[PDB]
Design a protein around this ligand. Structure first.
Ligand SMILES: Cc1cc2nc3c(=O)[nH]c(=O)nc-3n(C[C@H](O)[C@H](O)[C@H](O)COP(=O)(O)OP(=O)(O)OC[C@H]3O[C@@H](n4cnc5c(N)ncnc54)[C@H](O)[C@@H]3O)c2cc1C
Ligand SMILES: CCCCCCCCCCCCO[C@@H]1O[C@H](CO)[C@@H](O[C@H]2O[C@H](CO)[C@@H](O)[C@H](O)[C@H]2O)[C@H](O)[C@H]1O
Ligand SMILES: CCCCCCCCCCCCO[C@@H]1O[C@H](CO)[C@@H](O[C@H]2O[C@H](CO)[C@@H](O)[C@H](O)[C@H]2O)[C@H](O)[C@H]1O
Ligand SMILES: CCCCCCCCCCCCO[C@@H]1O[C@H](CO)[C@@H](O[C@H]2O[C@H](CO)[C@@H](O)[C@H](O)[C@H]2O)[C@H](O)[C@H]1O
Ligand SMILES: Cc1cc2nc3c(=O)[nH]c(=O)nc-3n(C[C@H](O)[C@H](O)[C@H](O)CO)c2cc1C
Ligand code: FES
Ligand code: FES
Ligand SMILES: [Br-]
Ligand SMILES: [K+]
Ligand code: NA
Lengths: 247, 384, 403, 197, 202, 406
């Protein structure tokens, strides 16, 4: 009975889609807040601003943080929905992204968005520090981090890896608070402003400006972190923008 | 049981002449075949450790180190010396203090599981455990903790062999499976720069790691500060696992069992072919960035456990292919995989153990292909 | 022509002199029932019955028409039976000269004889039992026919007698026998021999094939594998040269020829040589006064494949042309099986199937082409101690029963 | 070649069975006979080589956000559409057993319908939407993923057939030992863990 | 009640039947993830079996799978949305394991083997029972893998880790799939030795 | 709302396209009309099932019943048909029961073969023709302690065309019966009053059907003689309800009505010249008697015949006059009986023990050709198992031993 099969499949297909469509469209907004507060919790944590709870995070994020958009090819601010720009989606589309060459793609990121979002921290009506999203592939998965750089554009205030997939213990210590705290006070650039952040096998010399101890027995993941910064701390990453911040 | 009164011919057409070879004689031949690598393994284990200790400490500082490590002062008590003027006797004695506890633990613990399965299932004990115990003890770092040795043999004996019915009824190499268990369960004790030498506080990368970092030029014995020549790796005067170091010692033992017919020369031949082809192919392609592309065949041979695996573990009759054509295919995949893992796998400096295990899984398909093509030739009456 | 390299010649002491002499007089002879595959006997004699030369002793229930006749005239002195009343042997005490005669023909007519006529004479005399079918090494059914009859005119068994020495003495009978096989066969007769020369048949049906190499070269299974591959739908027959001489004698003289030349050899044999005896001759009497002192084992057949000549089985087997005397003293692939097996088979896999009892798998790998003698070397070299001849028959028996 | 590299990665480095551990239910069930396993792997390859490329167009032409309309993103129909597409092709595969009923309809039995839920088929399509595989890349991935699954199943069947000569404890025989075999098999597939596309 | 607990030990979806193996080997790294996955599998399996029963008599066999999967994917899709909006943190840990509930063979397997050919209420009872056995396996494997691989049970430090000051060195293989393969295999061994009725014949 | 409508339409459209493709596959990959199934060569016997996979289902629907104890599943293996044409190939589950030689002939399991095109199957003729006879009881006498002979009168002057060693089927209705109602004579009730076997009561929720061999050779026209053993609860399982049909049969008396069906059977005597040896036990005396009477009175066979019945005491023996008359009248036939525990009042002077050992020592041990004798056996499971082992140790092939396991 062809008529019977068409009636049941068509009738079920529209109606089930209706329940699914109603659930997805209706709950999307609630999901939207949940996704936003997750990023705000990280930006505050690295900034050194303790916040806890949705009410505090939203109130404090608006008070202290001013998201902005930056064009990598020029290192200059652009106007847009900084609060909503999705660099991940942009990097996947040729309209708002470019494809990297083997030489340019040091961090193994296949593509780099034409515009990437930055966050400005303002102690008062002036920006006391800038937070830059940086990502690059390690040994096992893409690792995404936020890096809070002081007004100098060279000294780093905080680091946090908010998305990574690596073996806990050997290579997964990018989440370890002690290793992240070692970055505070470090210099992103050298005397001549070339990416200089270096991950040191065996331990950095005491007082090292750009020496962060690598993950013991985890050279491959430590190499990825170095590759992450060498792309973003350079001409095709945030290099041009930080030059403007620098002076 | 019982006794009965009259016979039948079946039982009368017995074997009336048989060959001297038996399973017992096969295992003892292999057990003796690794003795030369084992005795040297200890001398090398002591020599590397003693050399590293003198490069790291001297005077009263060395005395404190010797007093705080039972391996060192036990060597002093028995007549050896930890000073750099120690002769071959003292080096072998110190290496023994590491090997024997590992071998004793592996033999007893693995033997307990063997007898337990035999006791409960009313099987007679099998002599194959002599090879698994000795080989497992010889493919681990000298510094391996005993409790990890116990766990490793248990996985190899039980999970890989006994649950399959014991000797002759499994498909995966038992000794390498225990090493694989420790490799992934406790990688820190069987990897890095701190496990291949018994000199406390010493960090030294082995040749494969050094080559992967800076090529042939990086090959340095930190204790001595001297270049590692190809001759050193062949003889085994290089850091590493106890037993694998001497490609020469392994070849001597491998020749006897190969001549005696215990080890398949088609498998060994296949391994050499697979390595040479792939290693030479990488050499030709070249790589301005990967130092491992340029490692030649003769260097691939004398580094790591290629020789030990190729001769004494890839030749495992139960886990290898049963067809002469399959034996060639089985060996080549091991040789290709070892080079592949060595060159294009960043995480692992060696790939022999993992390679054989991959090949164990596919030896049965190769045999199947050979046999199914044979059935078709027969169904065609051999074109007669 | 066809050269064999995969094989093994056992270097056992005491090879025969290859000179035919007269063996010890035999006053006892027997037929071994278990030698005939799948034979359920219908007894035609009882202990104390008097029998003639070619008189029927028993018949096969599962092979109707096949008659197993006495080798000699005399008295039936025992009928040994084993477990489940399996007929072990029918011992006949030699005593007399009575015989059953048959039709005789001139040598120039044998090639032209009618096929059914040849079958009748062979069956009545009991010489039909010389043929064995591969697959399954059974005596052929009376009504069946074969396109390929294989004559084994070579012996690569250790301590075996040289067929050329025996056939030369009976050149006329051997050629006459080949002519008879030419008329009996639907196809061709394959005379598988070594390079030396043998008397030849002028019939176009009879082709000579030379095989050279270690032991397995002289086995009919090997020759069949290279010349006429056998299967369920392609059955070949096998007959040895001494039975061919008997066939020629039967159709020339009209009498059953039971004389045989067998090598008496072994480490404990004082004068290893070729001796004239009779079919089923008592081996206890044959080797009497010819062995060194001590506890020895008499084997009907070769050391590789053969029967322990003890008790009810202490008689020359029907298909055995040698007597070997010796002093009483898992499938881990070591390259062992492949080295002694020259056939296009995967030995370490077929043997695994026989050990496991995988009847269907063993057939695919070529078990149906095999007799026990084809696996004797595999049994010899097995680090594990298996008896593949027994395993093969168990698989073959399973195939017959279920099929 | 970019295509050759993707194909090698989706077979050996990213073996859906032994590397990602997807499709284990049919893999550990129908693994007994190589012939049945080969048929299933062949059937799985066909289903994958057609499913991923079909879903690639549907997602990029219809379901991708802002594909049909600007401001309308019917991505939420991703899970239902893909499984439905996979399920549709399964019914045709079931029908096709009119030519292969002996070897596979019967050997698979209840599992022939379940090939729609192999994680490998759903998972493979999911990786094609997260990644940015072109239609040509979608075919290479689907074919490559299937081939890697067939190699393992055919390999696991080869091992199991070889083990007929084993004395496995009862209770462990069948499902219990098969789980141990796949666990041991995955160990040897870890040879590719570090490999870089 | 007896029908609900039958698929725990008598016809376990992972031990006797061969369903849901993929999810058992992936989420058993923590008992927390395993338990949420089991409740999710329980919720979907019970409802999916229930809906298929209502329309079993009215389903065409040609488009049978299409009808059924539409039901199964729809429920999981809704569950993913609920998890994203409420319990957002829990949704994030589950990654694709939420979407992969759809391919869990228990859901479609019991839907075809049992819900059709059977009544909706009892079909619902069958879906709950399989989720229990699925969770019996998920929780047993999660216990060994988390205790030895992480030294923790439900995130609670049970075994002090050397990195914290303790004595236990975690086993890295317990974090990988093969451990799950072996644990499940040994679990079946215990069940079939305590229940010889389930043993497979030679 | 807005995007929701957009999603609902694109979804429905997509799935429908899939359904359209699936239907296209149904039209081309699975065309079907109606299948014709041929039974034997008779056009009357023919099934027009539209194709649907099973054969046992299409056949049951048409009117032919083949045994299917398990009900499909390839478990009982009692459903066997010869599908000479059609049916494809033999599935491995069927091969578990069907031998290679039998499968080659065309043997197939109906519950496993899929009807997909016209096929011709060869079903036994006896299945089509089953006849119902509402008989009237003539005698229900106790032949022994726990055996009753039920004599049934065939109605209308009719007779049953059954074979020797055959059996029929009794269809009793729902009934509650008390053992106290039984008519156990005083001679045999000693054991019954001892264990209080009268206490038992049988209750049957629904009508039931069972099979019973005949103990009257075909020429005894008019009457279906039968021997029935009461199924009292088992010695190792005393705590069970009693027998259902046997209790009902014992409850019957003269004048009662009993509906049957039949004939059926394959425990027939082989048409050869070989010596026959019969080994009976308990109710096994029914098929043995029919066999012996058929071969002496109707076939008037001169073949050598022997009968060896196992009993516990002289009272248990029955049909002594008939065998004694046949043994006297015919020189080819001799019968014997052995008492496992002879009574003081028996004054037994014959064989004592189990018939396996009685037969071996008396006849088969010294027999020259035990192998050349046809053996027909019917008796207690312990007795059958013992005899078969003894015969096999004498070299008797399975083809010469035909059993009648009940
Ligand atoms: C060809 C053929 C010929 C036959 N000829 C004869 C014949 O001549 N005479 C004859 O007597 N039979 C004969 N039989 C057997 C007959 O068909 C019946 O099997 C027999 O009569 C028992 O009938 P019943 O229904 O009362 O037994 P059932 O009702 O099936 O009971 C059988 C036994 O099981 C016990 N039981 C009941 N419930 C349980 C429980 N829960 N657990 C354990 N045990 C339990 C009963 O107490 C009884 O002992 C023949 C069968 C065949 C196939
Ligand atoms: C029975 C065992 C086998 C017996 C020996 C068999 C002979 C096998 C020879 C294989 C072919 C020759 O092997 C050859 O080795 C030399 C060193 O010796 C390599 O010499 C060098 O060349 C390459 C560039 O081409 C360099 O990157 C590298 O330093 C090294 O590989 C050659 O590149 C290789 O091609
Ligand atoms: C990773 C490197 C090493 C592994 C890669 C190489 C794997 C090679 C093996 C491929 C798989 C085995 O493939 C195997 O081939 C043989 C013929 O040779 C087939 O043999 C069979 O195929 C047909 C079906 O087409 C069957 O009906 C029949 O029984 C037989 O002919 C097996 O059924 C198939 O399963
Ligand atoms: C089949 C899947 C795998 C199943 C097998 C997995 C078992 C996993 C855990 C095994 C038990 C581990 O238990 C382990 O016991 C040893 C015993 O010395 C402890 O080891 C302790 O003592 C030894 C010797 O004194 C010290 O060298 C060591 O540093 C110390 O930690 C480990 O710290 C503990 O972790
Ligand atoms: C030549 C040879 C090599 C062997 N190699 C190994 C080995 O590498 N590892 C091992 O555990 N056993 C080894 N054995 C012992 C035994 O054969 C092996 O464990 C089987 O896998 C047991 O079934 C070897 C035995 C022989 C004769
Ligand atoms: S749960 Fe069944 S295939 Fe993954
Ligand atoms: S009905 Fe039971 S086997 Fe077919
Ligand atoms: Br980017
Ligand atoms: K590297
Ligand atoms: Na070395």
């Amino acid at each position: 009975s062809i008529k019977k099969t068409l009636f049941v499949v068509i009738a079920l297909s529209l109606v089930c889609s209706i329940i699914v469509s109603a659930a997805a469209v209706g709950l999307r907004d609630k999901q939207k807040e949940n996704a936003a507060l997750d990023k705000q919790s990280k930006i505050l944590q690295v900034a050194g601003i303790e916040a806890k709870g949705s009410k505090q995070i939203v109130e404090l994020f608006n008070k202290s943080i001013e998201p902005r958009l930056v064009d990598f090819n020029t290192g200059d601010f652009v106007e847009g929905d900084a609060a909503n720009y999705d660099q991940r989606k942009a990097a996947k589309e040729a309209s708002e992204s470019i494809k990297l060459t083997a030489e340019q793609d040091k961090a193994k990121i296949q593509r780099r968005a034409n515009v990437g979002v930055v966050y400005l921290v303002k102690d008062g009506d002036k920006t006391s520090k800038v937070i830059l999203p940086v990502h690059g592939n390690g040994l096992w998965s893409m690792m995404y981090a936020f890096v809070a750089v002081e007004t100098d554009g060279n000294t780093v205030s905080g680091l946090t890896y908010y998305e990574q997939g690596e073996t806990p213990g050997l290579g997964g210590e990018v989440e370890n608070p002690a290793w992240r705290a070692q970055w505070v006070g470090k210099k992103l650039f050298d005397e001549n402003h070339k990416p200089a952040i270096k991950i040191v096998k065996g331990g950095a010399p005491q007082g090292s400006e750009h020496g962060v101890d690598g993950l013991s027995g985890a050279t491959l993941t430590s190499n990825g972190v170095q590759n992450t910064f060498d792309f973003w701390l350079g001409d095709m990453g945030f290099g041009p923008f930080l030059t403007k911040v620098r002076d | 049981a019982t006794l009965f009164y009259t016979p039948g011919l079946v039982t009368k057409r017995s074997s009336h002449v048989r060959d001297s070879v038996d399973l017992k004689r096969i295992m003892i031949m292999v057990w003796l075949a690794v003795f030369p690598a084992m005795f040297w393994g200890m001398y090398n284990a002591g020599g590397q450790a003693i050399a590293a200790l003198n490069h790291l400490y001297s005077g009263d500082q060395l005395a404190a180190i010797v007093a705080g490590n039972w391996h060192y002062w036990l060597t002093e008590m028995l007549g050896g010396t930890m000073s750099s003027d120690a002769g071959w006797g003292s080096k072998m004695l110190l290496g023994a203090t590491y090997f024997l506890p590992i071998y004793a633990t592996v033999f007893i613990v693995g033997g307990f599981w063997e007898v337990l399965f035999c006791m409960v299932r009313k099987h007679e004990v099998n002599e194959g455990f002599f090879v698994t115990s000795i080989l497992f003890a010889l493919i681990v770092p000298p510094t391996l903790p005993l409790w990890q040795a116990a766990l490793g043999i248990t996985f190899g004996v039980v999970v890989a062999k006994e649950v399959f019915g014991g000797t002759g009824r499994n498909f995966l190499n038992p000794a390498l499976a225990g090493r694989a268990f420790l490799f992934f369960a406790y990688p820190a004790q069987i990897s890095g720069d701190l496990v291949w030498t018994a000199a406390d506080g010493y960090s030294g990368a082995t040749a494969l790691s050094q080559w992967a970092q800076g090529g042939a030029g990086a090959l340095i014995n930190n204790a001595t500060g001297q270049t590692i020549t190809w001759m050193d790796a062949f003889i085994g005067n290089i850091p590493g696992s106890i037993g694998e170091v001497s490609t020469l010692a392994l070849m001597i033992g491998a020749a006897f069992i190969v001549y005696m017919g215990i080890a398949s020369w088609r498998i060994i031949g296949g391994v050499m072919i697979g390595m040479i082809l792939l290693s030479t192919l990488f050499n030709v392609i070249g790589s301005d960035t990967n130092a491992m592309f340029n490692m030649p065949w003769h260097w691939h041979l004398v580094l790591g456990g290629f020789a030990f695996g190729m001769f004494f573990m890839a030749t495992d009759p139960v886990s290898a292919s049963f067809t002469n054509s399959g034996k060639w295919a089985y060996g080549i995949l091991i040789g290709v995989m070892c080079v592949l893992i060595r060159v294009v796998n960043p995480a692992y400096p060696e790939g022999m153990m993992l390679a054989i295990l991959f090949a164990n899984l596919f030896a049965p398909l190769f045999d199947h292909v050979v046999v199914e093509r044979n059935i078709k030739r027969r169904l065609a009456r051999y074109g007669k | 022509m066809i050269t064999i390299k995969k094989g093994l010649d056992l270097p056992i002491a005491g090879t025969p002199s290859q000179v035919i002499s007269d063996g010890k007089a035999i006053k006892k002879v027997a037929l071994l029932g278990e030698e005939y595959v799948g034979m359920r006997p219908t007894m035609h004699v009882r202990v104390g019955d008097e029998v003639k030369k070619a008189q029927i002793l028993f018949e096969d229930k599962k092979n109707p028409g096949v008659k197993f006749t006495s080798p000699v005239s005399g008295k039936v002195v025992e009928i040994n039976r084993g477990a489940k009343r399996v007929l072990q042997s029918v011992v006949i005490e030699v005593a007399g000269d009575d015989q059953v005669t048959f039709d005789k023909f001139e040598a120039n007519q044998l090639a032209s004889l009618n096929r059914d006529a040849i079958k009748t004479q062979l069956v009545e005399s009991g010489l039909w039992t010389a043929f064995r079918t591969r697959p399954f090494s059974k005596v052929p059914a009376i009504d069946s026919t074969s396109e390929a009859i294989f004559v084994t005119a070579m012996d690569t068994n250790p301590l075996a007698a040289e067929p050329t020495v025996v056939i030369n003495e009976q050149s006329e009978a051997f050629v006459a026998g080949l002519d008879v096989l030419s008329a009996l066969t639907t196809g061709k007769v394959y005379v598988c021999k070594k390079g030396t020369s043998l008397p030849r048949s002028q019939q176009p049906n009879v082709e000579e094939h030379v095989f050279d190499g270690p032991h397995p070269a002289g086995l009919a299974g090997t020759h069949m594998h290279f010349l006429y591959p056998v299967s369920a739908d392609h059955v070949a027959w096998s007959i040895n040269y001494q039975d061919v001489i008997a066939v020629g004698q039967l159709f020339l003289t009209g009498e059953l020829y039971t004389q045989r030349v067998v090598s008496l050899a072994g480490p404990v044999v004082n004068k290893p040589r070729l001796v004239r005896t009779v079919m089923g001759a008592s081996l206890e009497q044959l080797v009497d006064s010819e062995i060194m002192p001590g506890e020895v084992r008499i084997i009907s057949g070769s050391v590789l494949s053969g029967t322990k000549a003890t008790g009810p089985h202490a008689y020359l087997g029907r298909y055995h042309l040698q007597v070997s005397v010796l002093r009483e003293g898992s499938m881990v692939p070591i390259g062992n099986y492949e080295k002694v097996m020259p056939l296009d088979m995967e030995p370490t896999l077929l043997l695994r199937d026989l050990c496991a009892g995988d009847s269907d798998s063993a057939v695919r790998l070529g078990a149906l082409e095999l007799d026990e003698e084809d696996l004797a070397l595999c049994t010899f070299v097995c680090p594990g101690k298996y008896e593949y001849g027994q395993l093969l028959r168990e698989c073959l028996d399973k195939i017959e029963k279920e099929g | 070649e970019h295509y050759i590299s993707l194909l090698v990665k989706s077979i050996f480095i990213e073996n859906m069975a032994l590397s990602f551990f997807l499709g284990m239910c049919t893999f550990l069930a129908v693994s007994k006979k190589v012939k049945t396993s080969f048929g299933l792997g062949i059937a799985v390859i066909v289903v994958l080589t057609i499913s991923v490329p079909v879903n690639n167009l549907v997602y990029n032409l219809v379901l991708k956000p802002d594909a049909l309309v600007e401001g309308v993103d019917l991505s939420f129909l991703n899970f239902i559409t893909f499984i439905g597409v996979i399920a549709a092709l399964v019914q045709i595969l079931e029908m096709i057993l009119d030519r292969f009923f002996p070897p596979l309809y019967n050997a698979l039995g209840i599992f022939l319908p379940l090939i729609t839920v192999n994680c490998a088929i759903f998972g493979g399509v999911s990786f094609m939407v997260q990644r940015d595989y072109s239609f040509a890349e979608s075919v290479v991935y689907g074919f490559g993923s299937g081939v890697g699954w067939m190699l393992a199943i055919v390999a696991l069947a080869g091992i199991r057939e070889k083990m007929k000569y084993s004395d496995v404890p009862p209770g462990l025989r069948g499902l219990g030992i098969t789980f141990i075999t796949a666990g041991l098999m995955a160990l040897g597939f870890m040879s590719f863990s570090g490999v870089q596309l | 009640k007896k029908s609900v607990l039958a698929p725990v030990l008598d016809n376990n979806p992972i031990a006797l039947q061969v369903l849901g193996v993929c999810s058992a080997l992936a989420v058993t790294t923590k008992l927390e993830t395993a338990f949420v996955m089991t409740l999710a599998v329980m919720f979907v399996t019970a409802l999916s079996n229930f809906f298929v029963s209502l329309i079993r008599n009215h389903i065409p066999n040609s488009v049978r799978i299409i009808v059924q999967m539409a039901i199964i994917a729809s429920l999981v899709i809704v569950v993913d949305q609920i998890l994203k909006a409420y319990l957002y943190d829990i949704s994030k840990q589950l990654s694709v394991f939420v979407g992969l509930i759809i391919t869990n063979c228990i859901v479609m397997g019991r839907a075809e083997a049992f819900a059709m050919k059977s009544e909706p209420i009892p079909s619902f009872i069958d879906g709950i029972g399989n989720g229990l056995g699925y969770g019996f396996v998920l929780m047993t494997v999660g216990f060994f893998r988390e205790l030895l691989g992480s030294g923790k049970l439900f995130g609670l430090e049970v075994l002090p880790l050397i990195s914290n000051g303790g004595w236990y060195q975690p086993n890295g293989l317990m974090l990988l799939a093969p451990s799950a393969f072996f644990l499940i295999g040994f679990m079946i061994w215990a069940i079939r030795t305590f229940k010889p009725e389930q043993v497979e014949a030679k | 709302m807005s995007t929701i409508i957009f999603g609902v339409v694109m979804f429905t459209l997509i799935i429908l396209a899939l359904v359209l493709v699936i239907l296209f596959a149904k039209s081309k990959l699975v065309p079907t009309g109606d299948i014709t199934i041929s039974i034997n060569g008779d056009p009357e016997k023919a099934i027009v099932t539209q194709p649907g996979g099973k054969l046992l289902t299409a056949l049951a629907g048409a009117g032919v019943f083949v045994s299917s104890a398990c009900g499909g599943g390839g478990s009982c293996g009692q459903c066997r048909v010869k599908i000479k044409s059609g049916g494809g190939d033999i599935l491995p589950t069927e091969l578990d029961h069907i031998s290679k030689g039998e499968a080659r002939e065309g043997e197939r399991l109906a519950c496993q073969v899929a009807v997909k095109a016209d096929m011709d199957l060869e079903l036994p003729e006896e299945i089509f023709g089953v006849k119902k006879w509402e008989c009237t009881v003539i005698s229900n006498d106790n032949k022994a302690t726990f055996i009753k002979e039920l004599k049934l009168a065939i109605p209308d002057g009719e007779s049953v065309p059954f074979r020797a060693g055959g059996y029929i089927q009794i269809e009793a209705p729902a009934h509650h019966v008390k053992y106290a109602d039984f008519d156990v004579p005083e001679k045999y009730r000693g054991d019954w009053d001892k264990f209080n076997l009268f206490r038992y009561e049988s209750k049957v929720d629904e009508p039931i059907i069972r099979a019973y061999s005949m103990a009257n050779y075909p020429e005894e026209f008019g009457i279906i003689m039968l021997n029935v053993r009461i199924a009292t609860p088992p010695p190792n399982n005393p705590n069970v309800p009693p027998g259902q049909m046997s209790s009902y049969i014992w409850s019957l008396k003269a004048g009662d009505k009993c509906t049957i069906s039949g004939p059926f059977g394959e425990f027939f005597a082989k048409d050869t010249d070989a010596e026959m040896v019969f080994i009976g036990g308990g109710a096994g005396m029914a098929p043995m008697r029919s066999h012996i009477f058929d071969q002496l009175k109707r076939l008037k066979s001169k073949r050598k015949m022997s009968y060896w019945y196992g009993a516990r005491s002289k009272r248990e023996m029955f049909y002594v006059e008939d065998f004694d008359g046949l043994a006297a009248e015919n020189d080819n036939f001799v019968w014997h009986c052995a008492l496992s525990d002879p009574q003081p009042e028996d004054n037994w002077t014959g064989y004592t023990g189990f018939i396996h050992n009685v037969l071996y020592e008396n006849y088969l041990k010294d027999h020259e050709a035990p192998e050349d004798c046809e053996y027909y056996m019917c008796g207690p499971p312990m007795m059958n198992a013992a005899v078969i082992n003894m015969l096999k140790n004498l070299g008797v092939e399975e083809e010469n031993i035909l059993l009648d396991d009940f």
